[PDB]
Amino acid sequence: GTFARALDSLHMSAAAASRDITLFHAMDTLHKNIYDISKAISALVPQGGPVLCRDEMEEWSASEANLFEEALEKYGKDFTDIQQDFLPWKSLTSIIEYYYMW
Amino acid sequence: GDYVYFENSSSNPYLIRRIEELNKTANGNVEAKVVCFYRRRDISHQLRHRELFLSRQLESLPATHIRGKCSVTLLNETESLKSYLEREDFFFYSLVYDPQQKTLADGEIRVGNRYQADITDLLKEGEEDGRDQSRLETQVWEAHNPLTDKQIDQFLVVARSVGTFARALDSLHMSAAAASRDITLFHAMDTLHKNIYDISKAISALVPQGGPVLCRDEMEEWSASEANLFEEALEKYGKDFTDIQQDFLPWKSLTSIIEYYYMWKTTDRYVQQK
Amino acid sequence: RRKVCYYYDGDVGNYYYGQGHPMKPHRIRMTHNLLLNYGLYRKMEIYRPHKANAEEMTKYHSDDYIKFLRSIRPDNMSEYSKQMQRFNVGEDCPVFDGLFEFCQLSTGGSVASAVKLNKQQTDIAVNWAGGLHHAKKSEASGFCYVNDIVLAILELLKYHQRVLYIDIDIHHGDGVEEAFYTTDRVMTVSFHKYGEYFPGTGDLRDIGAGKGKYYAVNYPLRDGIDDESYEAIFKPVMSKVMEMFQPSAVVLQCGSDSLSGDRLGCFNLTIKGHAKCVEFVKSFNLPMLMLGGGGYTIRNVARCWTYETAVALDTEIPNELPYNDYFEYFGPDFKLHISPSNMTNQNTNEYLEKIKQRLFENLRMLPHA
Amino acid sequence: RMDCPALPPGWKKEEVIRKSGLSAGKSDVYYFSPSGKKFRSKPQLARYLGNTVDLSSFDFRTGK
Ligand SMILES: O=P(O)(O)O[C@H]1[C@H](OP(=O)(O)O)[C@@H](OP(=O)(O)O)[C@H](OP(=O)(O)O)[C@@H](OP(=O)(O)O)[C@H]1OP(=O)(O)O
Ligand SMILES: [K+]
Ligand SMILES: [K+]
Ligand SMILES: [Zn+2]
């Protein structure tokens, strides 16, 4: 995950890669591959290329993050209006997930 | 274009020249313009007896000076001459000689007990060579593995990722490149072989107890101030690496300074060229 | 497809001959590293050679020449100077820290591989560290201290009646020649510059002696030889050699100072041409032992032996050099191949055919049916 | 001052980087006899040693 996001801040990328979404994805990758370590590791590097899992926290753009801090400070915790007027291209439930992480 | 034998005024062998132009003046006197062929001595042994060099020296002398006509052949044509057709008249050239500058186209084998080797006799069909192979070699990579190129490739990516994550635990692109250097890869190919090409077992090796492993070559490993010392010692003692250690980096082993040197020569901030 | 064994000790790139000295062991490390990144390493059996001890180096050399080498250092350099002159260690063969370690690795690689060939558990075996062919029984010469080649060959004679030794290096392989000058079991063929060049030996008339007469083949050459000229005189001669000398194990010294733009060399060969020889030899499907040798424009030395390793694996590699620790060494181009220079080939067809014929006569003197 | 192993015992070589001017960054090579006499070129060193050493193949710059 850290090496993935190195291919397009060190401690930051590592922490980013250490978040739960990556772990959960790691526990599924195991189970999907029948708990075969050797098979599961291929899954993580499909064709020599690594995989990136980013939660809504990490995934949003600088300017989306910015929008959110304006919409909150202006509409409080009214997340349907926060979308309608500030982040209408995002799905409500992604804004919720972001909120809590933020 | 003919070649001629001129008077040698000292009594010595004739001077050889090529006729460039034959001229007769108004009073019927005949003079010749001639490019000089130099003798090997005069060019001031691999040189044969009849070597002559084509000079850039040009002279003009009367036709009475000519005592005989000759052939100055190519080297190939001289060597092809038969024993019977060998004559005083045959000469050769293979070199152009600048007379003004001096410019010219551009050890023994011994016999005896103290030179030759004693030849080792062929072993009988019953005799055995008696050579312990473990004292001679230790294998580092088997070429016939249960693994495929893809899996090895994949493992190499993983070995690289660990390495980057290792050096994240005490610059992103920098750490990744650092972890992508050959030392890490070589270590990745050994980790495979030591673990009998078991991917699952080999990956444990890379993360022994939940903790990753770091391989750093001398390039990456040296301190900022050691690196600094090196660039002072080089610029001051050139490539004299024993003195560079003695006086500048005496705590490092010579062979680590060598390994560093070569790695440093590819440095980016390093620009000796223009 | 032939099985290949590759011998390498990581330390070998790190030994250093001295400031201003052309022989640079680091070129083997450069090769090693390309091989890994070209994916070739993967495809062959990789061995670390244990250190060859004085025990097996004295199987050819003086008990007191090796003794001298084991002992000498840069410390006791002014104490030994007596013996230094008797053994040739100086002007162009320096003393240097680790020297004896260096010899042990070069010799270990060649010997281990010879065994490997005798034990019939490889077809080809490669040791780029080795090939140091100017060494003599009781003295160092031309950057060579121990003649790993002879020692290697001596082991092969234990299982092989006739051992052929081929030498591409621009310099005449006089060490391997002199060591086997009086035997008929080993034939030493060598193609090299001649005339105001080292080692001063190996002209047309250098045929051998005693039982070894008509068993030392030489091809003397002038400057600027093409791939085309070289190919056209190597294949004919070597096919006759095989025809006549009928060997059961080949040892090809793949000296890379016969390439174009070498620092010391003055031939005009490309990696392609140079390798065509290795490929031709390999084609005769005999147990084969590739060694290196000279080479002093190390960027190309690296290229060459990397390529020639591919040839032993008969796998293709791209001209695109793969990234590696020393990637930046390889010019603005970062390509594998080199092209020949405008340099003038002073080996006229007439001169090569004269020599060729003389050699064909020499080879005919051997027994056949 | 480094021992030069290819010269007789006690001989040393030193390389000095030029600090300024036209050839700033280039170096000069010097040799010292056992007593400390300084030499600045191959012909000067060869004249001093005479027939006690053969310097034909000696690379003054590298000391090899
Ligand atoms: O580091 P060394 O082993 O002493 O070799 C270097 C090196 O040559 P290689 O790169 O082939 O090893 C230099 O090359 P660059 O570092 O400039 O790429 C070269 O410089 P040139 O290629 O510009 O000649 C220089 O030669 P010189 O000392 O004549 O500048 C030469 O050092 P040596 O001549 O002592 O081998
Ligand atoms: K040769
Ligand atoms: K012979
Ligand atoms: Zn050579």
Author numbering:
A (entry chain D): 221 to 228, 237 to 330
B (entry chain A): 9 to 52, 101 to 160, 162 to 163, 165 to 228, 237 to 340
C (entry chain B): 8 to 376
D (entry chain C): 149 to 212
From the paper:
The Nucleosome Remodelling and Deacetylase (NuRD) complex is a multi-protein chromatin modifying machine that plays an essential role in cell lineage commitment and DNA damage repair. The deacetylase module from the NuRD complex contains three protein domains that control the recruitment of chromatin to the deacetylase enzyme, HDAC1/2. Using biochemical approaches and cryo-electron microscopy, we have determined how three chromatin-binding domains (MTA1-BAH, MBD2/3 and RBBP4/7) are assembled in relation to the core complex so as to facilitate interaction of the complex with the genome.
To explore the assembly of the larger complex, we used a longer MTA1 construct (residues 1–546) containing the proximal RBBP4/7 recruitment motif (R1). The 2D and 3D classification of the MTA1(BAH-ELM2-SANT-ZnF-R1):HDAC1:MBD2:RBBP4 complex suggested a relatively high degree of flexibility in the structure and a map of only 19Å using 10 066 particles could be achieved. It is apparent that the flexibility occurs at the point that RBBP4 is tethered to the complex. The flexibility is likely to be important for histone binding by RBBP4 in the context of the whole complex, as well as recruitment to specific transcription factors that interact with RBBP4. Although the EM maps suggest that the RBBP4 domains are relatively flexible, their positioning, and apparent range of motion, is broadly compatible with nucleosome binding to the complex allowing the WD40 domain to interact with histone H3 amino-termini.
